[PDB]
């Protein structure tokens, strides 16, 4: 018979650790240790100190992460995005657009 109890002390036996394969150089949704986001994950030479888990740019925005399953310090590029604009002659003259 196995007994399960829960107290105020921090539990050391969890056995959950949701994880997946790790995909570089594509736009992807991601989570690292509870840091959620979406973007293009890439390799980096950024020298995280051993206790550092995440990296940030000048405007406080995240730019890098440690993979908790390897030594990899990734750099996170945002999703490629931009405004879409339609070039048109006047519709009175033609229906073509670019």
């Amino acid at each position: 018979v196995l007994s399960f109890e829960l107290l105020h002390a921090p539990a050391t036996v969890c056995g959950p650790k949701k994880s997946t394969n790790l995909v570089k150089n594509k736009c992807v949704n991601f989570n690292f240790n509870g840091l959620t986001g979406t973007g293009v994950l890439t390799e980096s030479n950024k020298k995280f100190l051993p206790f550092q888990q995440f990296g940030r740019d000048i405007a406080d925005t995240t730019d890098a992460v440690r993979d908790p399953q390897t030594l990899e310090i990734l750099d996170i590029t945002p999703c490629s995005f931009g405004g879409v604009s339609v070039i048109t002659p006047g519709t009175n003259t033609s229906n073509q657009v670019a």
């Binding site: 740019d57 000048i58 405007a59 925005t61 945002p78 995005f81």
Partner: peptide, 22 residues
């Protein structure tokens, strides 16, 4: 203009040098 160069003048180059998320 200096034709050997963005074909800016000499004084335009000083001005383009001194003047100095998503």
């Amino acid at each position: 203009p200096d034709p050997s160069k963005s074909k800016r003048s000499f004084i335009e180059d000083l001005l383009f040098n001194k003047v100095t998320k998503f």
